[PDB]
Design a protein around this ligand. Structure first.
Ligand SMILES: CC(C)C[C@H](NC(=O)[C@@H](O)[C@H](N)Cc1ccccc1)C(=O)O
Ligand SMILES: CC(C)C[C@H](NC(=O)[C@@H](O)[C@H](N)Cc1ccccc1)C(=O)O
Ligand SMILES: [Zn+2]
Ligand SMILES: [Zn+2]
Lengths: 605, 605
């Protein structure tokens, strides 16, 4: 076992030098230099990574580790009860320890998200760092450098000291901020100012091909409007400057990861060039940006750990991620990243997910899903709808919508969730240290906006099994289903011609006919169907998405079952599904006579 | 978080009832009943599973959990710092707790190994169990039952009380032995006696199709000879009876998992029907059977944990798995499961793997690979040859071969590793409780066979970076390479037309030309190639395994480089490989002047 980290000074500087030039093998070469204290010394590879809420440190990708003290090799021994901890014996009279190793980043998605391509790379300093055990991470002064592919541009919130040729030397920085200061680099780069002033915000775009960088003025303006709308909500910025990192790519592994003064984001090459086709993911930058307030600056006390190698407590992720999921979609509408119609159909899809798409809510609480990061590490699960899957995101969002609606009702619409945002995250402009909070702090700040038993309200939703969608009705709308496609579903289905049929047949299909998801206790489930089975034919006709949708519509209101020819492994059988509700996709409709608070919430300030 | 398990009596019986009939959804339905006193109670889902040496308990597949005390639901709360631990409050006057849940076994291999098919199933009791925290697992008396698909046969070492219809009630058993008593069930079943007597051994075969069960007399005899050869080695059996469980299948997930009185094994449907083609995997039953002595009965003290929810120490896996890997191959030859020529070429491949196929030994020791189970959980890695990958298996095997050769050299061939086997595992016939050992015990028993500094010998090999293949030459043979295919490689290549070129071009390829492996610092590596790249053409000719092999031979002894057309993502380039050694496959050849101890080692006793 590794001794607990202590809030004591670390003498000297942890030097971290990274060679990021072996794009072909996708290898980051690392040298870490630090003072050596005589006696046993334990070095740690970061395990629990802020923003991942789970022990995602890729320990088995650390290879070629050789440790030398004052130029002599010393053998290392891994702690079999802490496989992220390497112990060496430092001789008496020693001065300096050097550890050299390689981070073997994924050569295919099966190994994790790809971090190197022929045109760009993603350096996450936790993957290229060893640091001494026994210290709070913030007490370790670090100084990093990286050697880039020839002539590549780079971007990071971390301040550059100098670039000599292709070796970038950064100014000293605390080790926790180093891990929190990722770098993108690439040959096709555009830097766009989103906000000038004393706390400026920039957008750093890297692409597989330069043509993807052609952001149009109104599209840049929508990102600039995001910054303005966050200013209206919070009244403060928790950074001295902010660097959006955005990779437009089909080669780099997808990412959305927040930091204090930056975020790592990926989109498709058509993020800008096909604005109307790429909209469903455009809440990404709003989401990760919001975390600078909600998650990085303010963090649950059980989540704000002293180093990267003690476990994180995720109990409050329904605020961290849940309210950020909420604000990401709201701010997308307020900024023009989304249209109001797009944002409303997205919210309808969230509401339907918890009204009808989450039968696991009968036995599992949203609170318990804050354990999903460590339980599952986002590995494949058979029934996201019944096992549940990180619903502290979207279920949390629905609770925060209801919180907004209740604040309005208590105050005759003079207060809203905007007032909680300013009160809870708006203090101490410019500070980007960690300001921890507890559950009781959430309650007290809500009670300060409008007096109410908020503790019971939050517990009843997060520890309950009942409806989470009450914020829809209270804010003047109603969740409905009809045969009109949901804007998000339609965009997500089309071009590949897939078929999302969650609320009719209780399954989703690829264009090939392969079932990609099955709703627990739904019609497909009750025919014994599982993901991976194939719908070969519908009423005798070779499967297509149009064919099965037409058959569903033809069965609406009749008593003639839909006949599905199914391939299960190497067997074929025909099932008859007595489903006659037609195609059903969620939308929101106004409740006439009630105030439309929802549109006010989603309106630009 | 969770209180430590104590060696104190457990009052009552843990009843575990499993319904294994939902083959379509692949769901095991579970009811666990246990004594309960009022107040706080913590229930555990097994986490660290004996024989996996890592926390493989599938916690995220436990769904639908409802806990009732005296018929009334009690809410449960998971420990966010121990996600395998469930906490409830037991009301006053209660005597009994009932927990019901479902184990959602993998619906595809991406979720883990498949455990249900239309013809067979594999029940592992740890996946269908909750048990009270605070107790040594061996102190908990359990009693299990299972409801099978209609008419299915079953086999397990656990003794049956009665079968009523399709519900099997088992006799009470200690909870640790329950977890150690898996069950196979299926519609195509054959039971074969391998040894009669007071400690009988049976082979239980389940198949996708009945024709695969047609074991011929000489093939059954080889399995009977395996039991006889183990008797000669150890002189004792650590079980009152033993049940081989063997699944001949393309649908059940592959498995080799040892137990005290049974093992879980899978083979191809042609395990018997194409005996000469399916030979490379036939050390499986010899391997897992050997674990009844080495691993189950004798186990490292740091591995022999008190329950399933504290971490296991794997430091001695180079004995547990390493010597079992050794005996699995030796016993295949001694029993006739393998021919002597097959076993020799298999050993040649192991020797070559550490002579030339493990460049990672320059920085990592075999000892450190005992941490790979927890580090990697057998997830994909880019360079098994450089990161290393559980080399305590085959590297351990090579060390034990050298131990054998050294015992012979010290004793003028009067003692061998067979004497260590009998001395270390041959005590206490009939005993199948765990008999722990430490490193010092290994040393003392070796020293008792022949006096020598065995501690330094073992450490020099397991903590070193040098050669592990010294036992080959010491026992009278020499590792050589030539263009004659290795029998194991040829069989593993055949039918699919793959190309293993580790010792020539430093890579392996599928018939498609996709690179499946790259040797660190080898020729393919030095051309920048990675797994997933595709060799499109060789000297301009469309790739095939024969085409690239012919080109390698054509380049032998010349100065004309091999031209490879390569697809890297969406780009094509041609590389010139200056490799002129020809095809090189490992074999063993006699050193004519030296005594042939290797053949003695592999000879039937
Ligand atoms: C591309 C998007 C879907 C990315 C999105 N990212 C986020 O929500 C971030 O704010 C999360 N902090 C990223 C995260 C959370 C838990 C475990 C691993 C990674 C996510 O769901 O991971
Ligand atoms: C089919 C064969 C390859 C199976 C073989 N099984 C064994 O060696 C058993 O003795 C191991 N005890 C199985 C094992 C070890 C570590 C982690 C998971 C599972 C294995 O390598 O897993
Ligand atoms: Zn987030
Ligand atoms: Zn084994």
């Amino acid at each position: 076992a590794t001794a607990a980290p202590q809030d004591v000074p670390f003498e000297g500087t942890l030097k971290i030098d990274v060679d990021a030039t072996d794009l072909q093998h996708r290898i980051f070469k690392v040298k870490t230099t630090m003072p050596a204290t005589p006696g046993p010394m334990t070095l740690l590879y970061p395990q629990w990574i802020p923003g991942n809420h789970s022990p995602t440190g890729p320990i088995d990708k650390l290879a070629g580790l050789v440790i030398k003290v004052d130029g002599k090799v010393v053998p290392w021994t891994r702690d079999q009860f802490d496989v992220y901890a390497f112990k060496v014996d430092v001789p008496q009279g020693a001065s300096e320890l050097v550890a050299e190793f390689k981070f073997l980043s994924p050569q295919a998605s099966s190994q994790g998200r790809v971090m190197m391509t022929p045109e760009m790379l993603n350096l996450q300093w936790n993957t290229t760092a060893l640091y001494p055990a026994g210290y709070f991470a913030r007490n370790i002064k670090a100084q990093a450098s990286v050697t880039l592919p020839a002539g590549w541009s780079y971007a990071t919130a971390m301040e550059t000291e100098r670039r000599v040729g292709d070796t970038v030397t950064f100014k000293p920085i605390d080790f926790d901020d180093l891990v929190d200061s990722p770098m993108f680099a690439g040959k096709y780069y555009k830097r766009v100012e989103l906000s000038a002033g004393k706390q400026p915000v920039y957008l750093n775009v890297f692409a597989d091909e330069a043509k993807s960088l052609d952001a149009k003025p109104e599209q840049i303006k929508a990102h600039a409007a995001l910054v303005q709308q966050m200013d209206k909500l919070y009244g403060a910025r928790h950074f001295d400057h902010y660097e959006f990192l955005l990779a437009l790519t089909k080669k780099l592994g997808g990412i959305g990861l927040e930091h204090h003064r930056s975020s790592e984001n990926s989109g498709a090459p058509n993020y800008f060039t096909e604005w109307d086709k790429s909209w469903t993911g455009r809440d990404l930058l709003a989401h990760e940006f919001n975390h600078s307030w909600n998650g990085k600056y303010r963090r649950g006390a059980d989540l704000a750990t002293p180093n990267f190698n003690v476990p994180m407590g995720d109990s409050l992720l329904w605020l961290y991620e849940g309210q950020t999921q909420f604000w990401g979609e709201v701010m997308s509408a307020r900024s023009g990243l989304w249209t109001q119609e797009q944002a409303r159909d997205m919210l309808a899809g969230v509401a339907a997910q918890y009204e009808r798409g989450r039968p696991g809510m009968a036995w599992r609480t949203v609170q318990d899903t804050t354990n999903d990061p460590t339980m599952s590490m986002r590995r494949p699960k058979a029934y996201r709808n019944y096992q549940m899957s990180e619903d502290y995101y979207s279920g949390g969002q629905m609770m925060w919508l209801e919180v907004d609606s209740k604040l309005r009702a208590l105050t005759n619409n003079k207060r809203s969730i905007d007032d909680f945002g300013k009160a809870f995250f708006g203090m101490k402009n410019g500070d980007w240290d960690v300001n921890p909070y507890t559950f009781d702090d959430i309650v007290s700040t809500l009670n300060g906006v409008a007096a109410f038993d908020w503790a019971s309200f939050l517990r009843s939703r997060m520890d309950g099994h009942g409806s989470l969608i009450g914020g829809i009705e209270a804010n003047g709308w109603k969740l409905v289903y009809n045969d009109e496609p949901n804007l998000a579903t339609k965009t997500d289905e089309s071009d590949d011609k897939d078929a999302s049929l969650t609320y009719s047949l209780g399954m989703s299909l690829k264009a090939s006919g392969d079932i990609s998801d099955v709703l627990w206790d739904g019609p497909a489930f009750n025919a014994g169907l599982i993901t991976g089975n194939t719908i070969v034919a519908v009423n005798g006709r070779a499967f297509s998405s149009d064919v099965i949708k037409d058959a569903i519509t033809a069965a609406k209101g009749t008593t003639v079952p839909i006949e599905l020819l199914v391939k299960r492994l190497d067997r074929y059988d025909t099932v008859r599904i007595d489903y006659h509700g037609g195609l059903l996709y969620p939308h929101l409709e106004r409740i006439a006579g009630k105030p439309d608070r929802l549109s006010e919430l989603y309106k630009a300030r």
